[PDB]
Structure 1
Amino acid sequence: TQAVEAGEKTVEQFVQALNKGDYNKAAGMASKKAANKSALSEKEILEKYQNIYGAADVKGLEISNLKVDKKDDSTYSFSYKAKMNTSLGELKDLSYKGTLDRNDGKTTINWQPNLVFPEMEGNDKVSLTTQEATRGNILDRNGEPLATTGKLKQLGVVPSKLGDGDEKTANIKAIASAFDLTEDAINQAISQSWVQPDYFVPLKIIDGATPELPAGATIQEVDGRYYPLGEAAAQLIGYVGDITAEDIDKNPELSSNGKIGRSGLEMAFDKDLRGTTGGKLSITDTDGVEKKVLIEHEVQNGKDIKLTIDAKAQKTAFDSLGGKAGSTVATTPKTGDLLALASSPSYDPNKMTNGISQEDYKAYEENPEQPFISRFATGYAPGSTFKMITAAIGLDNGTIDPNEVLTINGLKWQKDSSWGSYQVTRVSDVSHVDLKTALIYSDNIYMAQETLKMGEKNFRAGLDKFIFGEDLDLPISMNPAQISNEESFNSDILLADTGYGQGELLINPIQQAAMYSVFANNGTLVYPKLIADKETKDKKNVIGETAVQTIVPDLREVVQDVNGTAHSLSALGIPLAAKTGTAENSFLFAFNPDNQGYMMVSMLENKEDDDSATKRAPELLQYLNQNYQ
């Protein structure tokens, strides 16, 4: 039994040449072609493996229970169990068996087609099919689609069925108008390197708007990814891209023909949404008639994802910013439900996914207001809106007497002359200011002073009860909120600018909504929620019931009182508590203090002359007030 173990080594070498895909080395180990030896020549054996093992991406072949036993002086029979990896899964418990040829202490394999797959015979062959999966939808709280995959009415033109110089130039005129698109863009489209004369050339995607078509112009139906709210939810939802080689490197389970999320929720949930590809590996006879199924995995289409977003609230919130720089966030404060996450400016995510001209694309990329940013997750100084936090702490720790009246003269202030030229400024020269007056007029000086009276140690003990430094259990990329660029202020100037929402504070609009929810839950903080089925999470006693019952009445008066900063909202006739804000940027906070049915946080970045968040809030506040009670 040295010949026996020489036969064992011969099997193992064959198998290892296969694992390295060295199909030529393995074919070199076969006996000559003969009725009693190998069934094919060496090249005929090389080809079978390249075709079948190449096609199925066979590797990771592991044999077990190897047995080699003598039949006659020049013939040894062998048998082993094997597992192998294919590109569709793992094949487990294959029973291979064959014979070996001993001829002058040289041992080869009597190759037979049943050393590709156990049951194969003669001219049998192997087929490998895949069924790609269809991408799941993204839905709002009421099932309305925000990202959906389906048929799309696409527009295009044929260059030949268009004319010459006479009609080619006026049909361009004709189809350019019917569909609101450049007459020049039609000239650059028809003249790209790829455009043969008799091709279909794509121009636009359309939605229940197919007019009587000019001549040359034909529309065809395309499967595509579609975003019904377009740019109104583009930063939240994201867009999907073509799959590349680089994507398949980083993840070779993807197929070249899919789509892949590149930003927003499309990327955050790409595995759930993309599904799993179906596939089948079969042994067939010489005509492709299946004789044995080796692997069969049914396609699983992608899962639907349901959000808390209200598509109407979303559209309205985004339009109300009129294309200026800014962001709006709205919630149902007692549960966390995020009803709208708007950011302005924005981009047309339907073009990024289905085709965008080099012109429209360079528009977006260079625009200095930066439409690809998710401003509702960008950190900002919250602004003087923040004063209601400082005040809530003040009252909690005893520092602030609601009735203590301060006397303040002018618009500038400093603790003493040691602050040099740094002065807290305010906008309204009120002399006698208690808490109520300070919220109503947005009095930074009042708050600067009550902070310095309270001290770093007491402020941070209150601030610390919120969610600074945390990461929020949400599928949106965001840095946590900081108090300052370090672990302590080491200035009274900074301690004080921070008491009125400036300084080195960074809180993004989603985080602000979370902090301010205390005013709608008796001091308990309720965490923002974006996936509809998730459970509500809270943090109790963040501030006290009595700070809230003191501050909310003063926040109603920011609206009702004629000197309130948000008194333009009293015309609406709806119950509002609010605080306005500015940082050095315009801010608005508001919620319904009668039913706590809704809360919103709106921001206008680099406000234009006399523009403000407060001027843009009415249409959304009317909507939210009516539908969330």
Structure 2
Amino acid sequence: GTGRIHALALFFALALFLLGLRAWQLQVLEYERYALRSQGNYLKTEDIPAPRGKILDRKGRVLAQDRLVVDLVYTGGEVAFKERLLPLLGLEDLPQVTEPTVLKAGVPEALRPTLEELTAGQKNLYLRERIERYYPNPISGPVMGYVLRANAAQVKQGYSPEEEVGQAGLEAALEPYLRGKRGVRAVEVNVRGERLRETVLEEPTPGQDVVLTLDLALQRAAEKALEEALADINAGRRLNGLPEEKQVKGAIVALDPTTGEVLAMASAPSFDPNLFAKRPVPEEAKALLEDKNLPLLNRAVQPYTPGSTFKLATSYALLEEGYVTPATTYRCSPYIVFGGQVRRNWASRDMGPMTVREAIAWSCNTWYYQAVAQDPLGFVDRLARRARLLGLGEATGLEVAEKTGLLPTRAWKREAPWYPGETLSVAIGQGAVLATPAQIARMLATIATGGNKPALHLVKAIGGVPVQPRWEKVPGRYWKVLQEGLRKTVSEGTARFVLGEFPVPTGGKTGTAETPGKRRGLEHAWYMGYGPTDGSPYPPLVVVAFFENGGEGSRVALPAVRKVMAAYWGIKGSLEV
């Protein structure tokens, strides 16, 4: 009945001993950390800014960073040694203003040493330093993205207003990895009021550098190839009578089918990430947010109508379910009657007997009408089974925010009421088979590798840790048939004139999507294309280009892929020198 009290007496004795040991730590072991120079000098504590991480692609080219911003501010209006300053600054006069004003913003690395000798440490002339995110090699905004200061709702989450929060598609995913620890320091201030000794109380972590799988070479070509499509988009819309609609609505994705790395992704109309960053309140960026178009959204991850690109998966679901052998016989007629209305073909005359390889080649629509007419009610559900197996329904695993790709099933139509005539339109991609260019690029990469369904990831390594790519295999009994039909499209189908004489043997399939708005002749320009179908010493590559309402995928999207493919394999043009 007494020993428990002896323990409490021993407890508080060892408790006050630990406090005494804690004080002795600060008093004796840390007195060199709080010296005051034998004077009545006070101590001021200031936090250290956090160096945000550097975003660079492979091969080491920096894409995002942040350095100092040197500015010249002066108050009062004293000349000092201005006989040298006026020619150096090129102002020829000192504008006398009452409030502090800035002269020559963004002092270069050569002018700053010359100014520092002329600063003389005087009260009027000083050089303020600032932190701002700098993009040396700007990449399309909707992929790369921008940076803003901490929002009022974000301040309550432990954010300092000087911190930089990234709403970017890429810089939001990397924000937990790019942010550094905002350290805290303390400096002894003399009675006069100057810095004496700095004291690091919390070391600022300089953030982590992320290595992307993007190639700055292919990235320039991707954004470049979007602009020449406008000349083709306006040319196509000219034959229809529609206005020139000079806006370049579309995106493009180029990735490696083997390692699952994405090499080039660009959307349009992109913006400049340097606008939101360095400028305090850029008025041009405020108009970008209120834009009637979508200059910020990444059209590579947004759902659109795939069109004839989806028929490549319809043939996959047709071969795996056992509907058609790889050597079936169907004549590509000009017209087909499902039973209620007449299914129209893209052409107007008889094409001839075709197989699965020939149907993919010339992109015959009447093939997928006769074949689905056998079992139109059960194939639609099995179609989405294989479609989601190829990577069309589920996400792609991209770090950037991605939208949901909708695949139609009988259960979905019940919760949206089903009619049998919807399967043929769903088979080609008309029945709200919403897909994204990212998901579309993955579907082709699966067929290119012959089973492997890799995950799309922009990041190659965070910090120094190489991110391993995750794979997944799909049950495909007949892969070569699809691969042959894809090159048969380049060899003899739609891409005959662009890529027929091309050096690298390419395969792919063109695509146009009757827009649900009016169906007036301006479809969605689509084209997919994977790398060397033959054992040619060229690294594999998959490219998919999309354009909103561009129309004529063979005339707009197909050359856009030829440009990116030429930039990847280094295909020389008219260079006889």
Greater mean deviation of Cα atoms: 137-146 or 567-576: 567-576
Whole-angstrom distance in 2 between the partners of 1:618 and 1:285: 68
What residue number does 1:575 align with? 505
Q: For 1:479, what is the secondary structure of its paired residue? A: coil
CA RMSD in angstroms, aligned pairs only:
4.3
Whole-angstrom distance in 2 between the partners of 1:436 and 1:296: 70
What residue number does 2:485 align with? 554
Distance 1:575 1:278, change over 3 A: same
Q: 2:336 aligns with which of 388, 400, 413?
A: 413
Q: 2:62 aligns with which of 136, 145, 148?
A: 145
Q: For 2:318, what is the secondary structure of its paired residue? A: helix
Distance 1:242 1:356, change over 3 A: closer
What residue number does 1:320 align with? 225
Deviation at 1:375, TM superposition (A): 0.9
Q: 2:371 aligns with which of 447, 450, 453?
A: 450
Alignment of 1:361-372 (within 5 A): 361=285, 363-372=287-296
Deviation at 1:234, TM superposition (A): 1.6
What residue number does 1:99 align with? none
Matched AA of 2:155: I
What's the % identity of the aligned pairs? 23
Deviation at 1:441, TM superposition (A): 2.4
Greater mean deviation of Cα atoms: 330-339 or 318-327: 318-327
Equivalent residues of 2:358, 2:488 under 8 A apart? no
Distance 1:469 1:93, change over 3 A: farther
Equivalent residues of 2:390, 2:474 under 8 A apart? no
Greater mean deviation of Cα atoms: 303-312 or 528-537: 528-537
Distance 1:396 1:233, change over 3 A: same
Alignment of 1:177-326 (within 5 A): 199-200=101-102, 223-230=131-138, 232-249=139-156, 251-252=157-158, 254-280=159-185, 296-322=201-227, 324-326=248-250
What residue number does 1:117 align with? none
Q: For 2:459, what is the secondary structure of its paired residue? A: coil
Question: 1:186-218: CA deviations, max 9, x gaps?
Answer: xxxx9xxxx8676226788999999xxxxxxxx
Distance 1:519 1:300, change over 3 A: same
Whole-angstrom distance in 1 between the partners of 2:548 and 2:110: 36
Q: 2:358 aligns with which of 437, 457, 460?
A: 437
Whole-angstrom distance in 2 between the partners of 1:587 and 1:126: 66
Whole-angstrom distance in 1 between the partners of 2:222 and 2:323: 38
Deviation at 1:135, TM superposition (A): 1.1
What residue number does 1:134 align with? 51
Question: 1:116-167: CA deviations, max 9, x gaps?
Answer: xxxxxxx997643322221110110111111111246889999x99xxxxxx
Matched AA of 2:261: D
Matched AA of 1:590: G
Deviation at 1:367, TM superposition (A): 4.1
Q: 1:426 aligns with which of 334, 346, 349?
A: 346
Q: 1:617 aligns with which of 524, 545, 561?
A: 561
Whole-angstrom distance in 2 between the partners of 1:132 and 1:622: 44
Deviation at 1:485, TM superposition (A): 7.5
Deviation at 1:270, TM superposition (A): 1.6
Distance 1:278 1:446, change over 3 A: same
Whole-angstrom distance in 1 between the partners of 2:428 and 2:57: 36
Distance 1:255 1:415, change over 3 A: same
Alignment of 1:581-592 (within 5 A): 581-584=511-514, 585-592=524-531
Whole-angstrom distance in 1 between the partners of 2:20 and 2:392: 52
Matched AA of 2:398: L
Deviation at 1:246, TM superposition (A): 3.2
Alignment of 1:404-553 (within 5 A): 404-410=328-334, 412-417=335-340, 423-434=343-354, 435-454=356-375, 455-484=379-408, 487-489=411-413, 490-532=418-460, 533-544=466-477, 547-553=478-484
Say yes or no: does 1:391 pair with 2:315.
Answer: yes
Q: Gaps spanning 5+ residues in structure 2: where? A: 1-7, 25-39, 79-89, 113-126, 231-247, 461-465, 515-523, 572-577
Greater mean deviation of Cα atoms: 347-356 or 382-391: 347-356
Equivalent residues of 1:154, 1:221 under 8 A apart? yes
Equivalent residues of 1:559, 1:577 under 8 A apart? yes
Distance 1:459 1:222, change over 3 A: same
Aligned residue pair count: 471
Distance 1:381 1:314, change over 3 A: same
Equivalent residues of 1:556, 1:578 under 8 A apart? yes
Whole-angstrom distance in 2 between the partners of 1:613 and 1:92: 75
Question: 1:55-77: CA deviations, max 9, x gaps?
Answer: xxxxxxxxxx799x9xxxxxxxx
Equivalent residues of 1:382, 1:501 under 8 A apart? yes
Deviation at 1:478, TM superposition (A): 1.4
Q: Gaps spanning 5+ residues in structure 1: where? A: 1-64, 70-77, 84-90, 97-122, 162-173, 176-189, 211-218
Deviation at 1:535, TM superposition (A): 1.6
Whole-angstrom distance in 1 between the partners of 2:200 and 2:407: 57
Whole-angstrom distance in 2 between the partners of 1:611 and 1:202: 49
Matched AA of 1:587: W
Greater mean deviation of Cα atoms: 460-469 or 236-245: 460-469
Distance 1:66 1:423, change over 3 A: farther
Deviation at 1:256, TM superposition (A): 2.5
Distance 1:321 1:353, change over 3 A: same
Q: For 1:342, what is the secondary structure of its paired residue? A: strand
TM-score, normalised on structure 1?
A: 0.65
Instruction: Using CA pairs under 8 Å that are at least 6 residues apart, name the structure with larger relative contact order, 1 or 2.
Output: 2
TM-score, normalised on structure 2?
A: 0.70
Matched AA of 1:538: W
Distance 1:199 1:295, change over 3 A: closer
Whole-angstrom distance in 1 between the partners of 2:175 and 2:20: 30
Whole-angstrom distance in 1 between the partners of 2:131 and 2:291: 31
Deviation at 1:262, TM superposition (A): 2.2
What residue number does 1:604 align with? 547
Equivalent residues of 2:336, 2:369 under 8 A apart? no
Deviation at 1:267, TM superposition (A): 2.0
Q: 1:564 aligns with which of 486, 494, 505?
A: 494
Deviation at 1:576, TM superposition (A): 0.4
Equivalent residues of 2:380, 2:410 under 8 A apart? no
Bigger-Rg structure (1/2):
1
Equivalent residues of 1:383, 1:583 under 8 A apart? yes
Distance 1:154 1:147, change over 3 A: farther
Q: For 2:59, what is the secondary structure of its paired residue? A: coil
Distance 1:460 1:510, change over 3 A: closer
Q: 1:594 aligns with which of 502, 520, 534?
A: 534
Whole-angstrom distance in 1 between the partners of 2:271 and 2:219: 15
Equivalent residues of 1:277, 1:299 under 8 A apart? yes
Equivalent residues of 2:387, 2:393 under 8 A apart? no
Equivalent residues of 2:494, 2:509 under 8 A apart? no
Equivalent residues of 2:396, 2:442 under 8 A apart? no
Whole-angstrom distance in 2 between the partners of 1:157 and 1:279: 29
Distance 1:355 1:581, change over 3 A: same
